[PDB]
Amino acid sequence: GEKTAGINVRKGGISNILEELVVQPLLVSVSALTLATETVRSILKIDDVVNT
Amino acid sequence: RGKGAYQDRDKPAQIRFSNISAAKAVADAIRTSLGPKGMDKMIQDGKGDVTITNDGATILKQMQVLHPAARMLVELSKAQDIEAGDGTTSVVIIAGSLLDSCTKLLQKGIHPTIISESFQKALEKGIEILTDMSRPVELSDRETLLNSATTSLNSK
Amino acid sequence: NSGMNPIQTMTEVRARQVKEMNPALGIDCLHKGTNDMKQQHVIETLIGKKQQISLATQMVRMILKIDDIRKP
Amino acid sequence: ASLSLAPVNIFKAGADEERAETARLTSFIGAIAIGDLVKSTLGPKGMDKILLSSGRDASLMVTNDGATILKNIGVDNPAAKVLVDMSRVQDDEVGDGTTSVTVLAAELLREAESLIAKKIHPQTIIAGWREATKAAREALLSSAVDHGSDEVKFRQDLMNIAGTTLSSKLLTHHKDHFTKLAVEAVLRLKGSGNLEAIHIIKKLGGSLADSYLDEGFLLDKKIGVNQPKRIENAKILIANTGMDTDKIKIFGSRVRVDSTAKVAEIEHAEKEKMKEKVERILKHGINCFINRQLIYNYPEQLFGAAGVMAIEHADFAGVERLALVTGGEIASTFDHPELVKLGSCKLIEEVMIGEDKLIHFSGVALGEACTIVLRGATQQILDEAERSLHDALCVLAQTVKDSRTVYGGGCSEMLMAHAVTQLANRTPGKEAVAMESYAKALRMLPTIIADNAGYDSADLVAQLRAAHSEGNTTAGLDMREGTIGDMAILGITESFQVKRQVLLSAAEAAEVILRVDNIIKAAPR
Amino acid sequence: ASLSLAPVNIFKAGADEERAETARLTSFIGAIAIGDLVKSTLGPKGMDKILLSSGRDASLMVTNDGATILKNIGVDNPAAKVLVDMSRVQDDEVGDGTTSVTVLAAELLREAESLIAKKIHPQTIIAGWREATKAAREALLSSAVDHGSDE
Amino acid sequence: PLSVFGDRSTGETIRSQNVMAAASIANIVKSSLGPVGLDKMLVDDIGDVTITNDGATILKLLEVEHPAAKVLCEL
Amino acid sequence: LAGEGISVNTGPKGVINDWRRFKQLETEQREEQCREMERLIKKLSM
Ligand SMILES: Nc1ncnc2c1ncn2[C@@H]1O[C@H](COP(=O)(O)OP(=O)(O)O)[C@@H](O)[C@H]1O
Ligand SMILES: Nc1ncnc2c1ncn2[C@@H]1O[C@H](COP(=O)(O)OP(=O)(O)O)[C@@H](O)[C@H]1O
Ligand SMILES: [Mg+2]
Ligand SMILES: [Mg+2]
């Protein structure tokens, strides 16, 4: 149930990171996920390579 | 339903495997430049110019990759830089990992169209999960802004 | 090789093997209408399978242990 | 004897020729190769191609459009050149059907190769193909249905056609949203056929579903230094004057005086002339001024002092689109303000798209000009989305011009094949065999459509043929599951113009290629 | 991933491999070329061929026999080699039929190419051909007539 | 798999190479430190001669290829 | 000896590395020869 459990490098282990002040905006993870999924979907719809 | 439709070509499978291998190679290349413990890469172009950088978009665009899938990954990093501004390495790593999974998915005998729709469903569910996990913030809170900036600079 | 869907057929055969105690359920390559290999009389030597597994494991270990190449 | 195989040689060095069998072999090989390459990109389940350029730039292109695929390939086979030019002309005439016409021509030429191998003179094949083309064209014309009179039915038909066109392309993921977008964009033209009035702006970043049709208009130009960045109830004057060191057009004129004071006086006179021109422009009572050409610093500050926006360097397309969307008149003289119509819009402001700033026109008066913002994850995705949207807009504009529609999903092809077979069943001679081959290619088209999806194409095509023979004239391929269904109910429709053009162009190219029995090549440069 | 279409190079200089579609294309092309070459010398109205040796001897030999035509040709397509050896073995076993067997094999392989283009697994084609061969052989045996008693 | 037109060095190899370049640059001028140091006489391959002890002059006159060494020179 | 129409595939893409490796040297040789021929034959002949 620890939603904020993350990798702690200062203590070299696992711990809560909100107390380590490690945060990023939502429109970083959301944007990365959306863009990566779109690129993967675009790549999957390819079946041939033609040289001009 | 019996034997089913026979695959005459086997060329689309080779193309898909080559694209996935190129993307996975790009991710493994920019895999060690992630997080506060990541290290910078040094790039020397055709001229004498030298670049030492940790930015994923800069690393990808500085080096000529010559492969189509790698070029879509470079464009992906550029787009992520345009929209969000950071995470340009994480998006490329995620795309490479997704295609690496698609390798085994295709080998299992799944058409690369069910994979796309299932990935869209997973993306929507993950967007819902991330939105649920998020926390509201206001610009009047200087501490959160300072923490975000420090986290951004932690890996440089 | 037989045109069937690999993952679906293998999963179904594995589930059938788990449900009913029968290690002789295989892939109906010839479409004879059954998955039990005793009636289909598909028989392999135990020595052959054991040698296959052993040799594959040893070669995989040997390949995994190599970490440097020094070609001219 | 022949020129090539003669005791004496009649040719320059490097020039040769190919006789009947050899020329036919090369032409058929080239046509079949082109058809096989362009296919597998046909139908809802068709895939895309990667066009990796071998030049210094090494442009990378991922596309599904057959015409673009055939354009950017080094083609040596002359028959392949004929097919490529066919695809280009098909794209020029209508936005869709390039892959369909190319595949149909290739299949026709394959059947022609089989018939020639069966010892049939090509003229007999050509005559049979002409008869079959006439019969198929008559059947397709009889099959066309029109809904132009009914507004709601015509709108539904437009949505169906846009969805059918976008089903094959990369936009099939968001087909619904993109269909609404394209239909609204075409409907905003108010019947005008100028697709240049629709501007497609590609901005990197953001999901493909983030694309939208702007309610007003967007411009990618800048504003003067000391001019307002936001005005309301704008009265826009669109112009095509110089206003940049504007010189009197007497080319032989010059300044020749005996002192520098006279030079200063002439310079002050020039500045006064520019100021008077700006005053004449301002006499129109305007808020925003858009000039096609550049605007220099003196008119810039003159406009800024009057609180007037001065958008400069808007190209011919820019001023034309602004006039279309706002109703203003492109003026080059300002001596009769009462005879110039000023464009009007509710609000002008600057919007922030991606990392770029664009001028936004909102609440436009006319609005007969659209701007579409495309957002994507890669440049290739943006280019392919633009190409697919262009195809959809072209087909929708053609449907607006001519509202006759036919059913897709192979229904039209199977109906044509049934008509051709019925004609051939009552014709004696080898022309019957030629018409049977024509019908076979027409049936091969939906066969390839079904192949691209991994379906049981043979069974589906046999079922379609049986249904069309029975009397079910609207039966077609149901690509959702892999059965046959009613295309009228399922809403797969095409433009009658597109299908007719595909059929006629394929027949024409097959006929002209089949007529060739000798390919003579000059020495390459 | 294919043996040849991989970033890692697994072959010696000059070695190469051809995958499913490419191998089928080359085999069918070679077989059909051999069949078209040997044919037109079949039946009562068949024509002869000129075989010009490119060696020092420069031997000239006109012939109508399919086996001799297929023997003295430089063949590099492996399927063409298969058909050539078929014709040679047919000539060794019986005196005639060298052209007919090659033409029949070429036509069968052309039909196989069409069937593959129709998305039919080659194993299904092989099974159907085995059954058809059994039926045809039985019919041919039933149609045979013997006159070894009356002189 | 990368298909990048160039050479790539990763891990301890590149670190050791950078340290080698820096140590070589240091050893170039290490003999001209302190009062018991001695000067160097540079030749510009056109007959030009420069006798100097200043480190900046020595490092500017020399042409250096490795970039980690260029870092020390511009330092 | 048929099927000349190929349009090839990513095979040449798989060999771009060696292609450019040889092409850079070829271009350098071409540049050297062009700078040599700007005088030779152009003035030696007449
Ligand atoms: N102090 C930290 N402790 C743990 N994780 C961190 C810390 N700082 C950054 N990270 C994580 O490292 C990841 C990589 O970020 P970074 O290396 O800057 O490249 P990018 O921003 O392109 O992903 C981020 O997703 C972030 O969550
Ligand atoms: N949803 C669909 N169901 C059945 N058939 C379709 C559908 N969408 C398109 N098609 C068919 O696919 C064929 C090819 O269309 P497309 O590939 O989009 O453009 P082009 O005509 O240039 O090939 C058309 O003839 C059309 O009849
Ligand atoms: Mg970061
Ligand atoms: Mg289309």
- Reduced 3-state DSSP string for chain F: CCCCCCCCCCCHHHHHHHHHHHHHHHHHHHHHCCCCCCCEEEECCCCCEEEECCHHHHHHHCCCCCHHHHHHHHC
For residue B115, report the distance from its CA to the centre of ligand 3, in Å: 30
CB pairs under 8 A between D and G: 22
Write the CA distances from D455 to B8, B108, D482, E90, integer angstroms.
14, 19, 6, 43
SS3 (DSSP) at B22: helix
Q: E strand or H helix at A2, and its extent?
A: none
Q: Is residue D99 within 8 Å of D38, Cβ to Cβ? A: yes
Given the CA of residue B88, which atom of ligand 1 is nearest to it? 22
For residue A38, report the distance from its CA to the centre of ligand 2, in Å: 23
All residues at 6 or more sequence positions from D449 whose CB lies less than 8 Å from its CB, including other chains: D42, D43, D409, D410, D477, D479
**C-alpha dihedral sign at D360, D362, D367, D370:** positive
Note whether B65 contacts F4, CB cutoff 8 Å: yes
Say how far apart CA D250 and CA B88 lie, in whole Å.
Answer: 58
Write the CA distances from D197 to D188, D316, D369, integer angstroms.
10, 12, 5
Chains in contact with C, where contact requires at least 3 CB pairs less than 8 Å apart: B
Say how far apart CA B97 and CA B116 lie, in whole Å.
Answer: 15
Chain G meets chain A (3+ C-beta pairs below 8 A): yes
Residues of E with CB under 8 A from a CB of G: 5, 7, 25, 29, 33
SS3 (DSSP) at D199: strand
- Does A51 belong to an annotated binding site? no
- Strand extents, DSSP E, E5-77: 49-52, 60-63
Give the largest CA-CA distance in chain C. Answer: 57
| G10 and chain B in contact, CB less than 8 A | yes
Q: Which residue has the tokens 């044919």?
A: E39
D78 is written with which tokens?
Answer: 């002359």
Number of Cβ within 10 Å of residue D432's Cβ equals 17
Looking at the DSSP bridge assignments, the partners of residue D345 are D234, D364
Write the CA distances from D85 to C21, D26, D103, D268, G30, integer angstroms.
66, 18, 14, 60, 36
Number of Cβ within 10 Å of residue D164's Cβ equals 24
CA-angle at D284, arms to D279 and D287, nearest 5°: 90
CA distance A49 to chain G (A): 5
Say how far apart CA D502 and CA D480 lie, in whole Å.
Answer: 25
Counting Cα atoms < 13 Å in the Cβ hemisphere of G30 gives 6
Say how far apart CA D506 and CA D105 lie, in whole Å.
Answer: 5
CA-angle at D70, arms to D69 and D76, nearest 5°: 135
CB pairs under 8 A between A and G: 11
Could you report how far apart the first and last alpha carbons of chain D are, in Å?
Answer: 29
Closest ligand to C-alpha of residue D169 is: 2
CA dihedral of B42, B45, B49, B55, whole degrees rounded to 10: -40
For residue B76, report the distance from its CA to the centre of ligand 3, in Å: 16
Q: Is residue D287 within 8 Å of D264, Cβ to Cβ? A: no
Looking at the DSSP bridge assignments, the partners of residue D358 are D351
- Does D494 belong to an annotated binding site? yes
Note whether B64 contacts F1, CB cutoff 8 Å: no
Say how far apart CA D380 and CA D388 lie, in whole Å.
Answer: 12
- Going by the DSSP 8-state scheme, the letter that residue D339 receives in this structure is G
Say how far apart CA D217 and CA D234 lie, in whole Å.
Answer: 14
Write the CA distances from F63 to D454, E87, F52, integer angstroms.
64, 75, 16
Counting Cα atoms < 13 Å in the Cβ hemisphere of D221 gives 24
E29 is written with which tokens?
Answer: 């092309």
Ligand 2 near D87 CB (within 6 A)? no
SS3 (DSSP) at D469: helix
Closest ligand to C-alpha of residue B37 is: 1
Write the CA distances from C43 to C15, C36, C37, D22, D277, integer angstroms.
22, 11, 8, 56, 101
For residue D97, report the distance from its CA to the centre of ligand 4, in Å: 6
Which B positions 67-86 lie with beta carbon below 8 A of chain G? 67-68
Which residue out of B32, B33, B34 has the highest number of ligand 1 atoms within 8 Å of its CB and is therefore the one to mutate? Answer: B34
Note whether B123 contacts A28, CB cutoff 8 Å: no
Q: Is residue E125 within 8 Å of B11, Cβ to Cβ? A: no
Chain D meets chain G (3+ C-beta pairs below 8 A): yes
D108 is written with which tokens?
Answer: 């026709």
Q: Please list the alpha-helical segments (H only) found in C1-72.
A: 6-19, 37-40, 46-65
CA dihedral of B144, B150, B151, B155, whole degrees rounded to 10: 170
Closest ligand to C-alpha of residue D392 is: 4
The sheet with strand D198-204 has its strands ordered as D198-204, D370-376, D212-213
Given the CA of residue B151, which atom of ligand 1 is nearest to it? 8
Say how far apart CA E125 and CA E121 lie, in whole Å.
Answer: 7
Ligand 2 near D449 CB (within 6 A)? yes
CA-angle at E116, arms to E114 and E119, nearest 5°: 115
Which residue out of B58, B74, B90, B92 has the highest number of ligand 1 atoms within 8 Å of its CB and is therefore the one to mutate? Answer: B90
All residues at 6 or more sequence positions from E74 whose CB lies less than 8 Å from its CB, including other chains: none
Write the CA distances from A16 to A1, A8, A19, integer angstroms.
12, 8, 6
E69 is written with which tokens?
Answer: 């035509």
Q: Which residue has the tokens 């190219």?
A: D509
Ligand 1 near B154 CB (within 6 A)? yes
Say how far apart CA D53 and CA E76 lie, in whole Å.
Answer: 34
- Of the candidates D164, D140, D163, D166, which has an alpha carbon nearest to the alpha carbon of residue D442? D140
Residue B47 amino acid letter: K
Write the CA distances from E63 to C64, E43, E71, E93, E140, integer angstroms.
62, 14, 12, 20, 30
Say how far apart CA D350 and CA D336 lie, in whole Å.
Answer: 32
Say how far apart CA D54 and CA D61 lie, in whole Å.
Answer: 12
Given the CA of residue B56, which atom of ligand 1 is nearest to it? 22
| B25 and chain F in contact, CB less than 8 A | yes
- Phi/psi at B52 (nearest 5 deg)? -115, 115
Say how far apart CA E115 and CA B3 lie, in whole Å.
Answer: 15
β D288-291/D231-239 pair status: parallel
Task: Quote the crossing angle between the two packed helices D122-143 and D411-424, to the nearest 10°.
Answer: 130
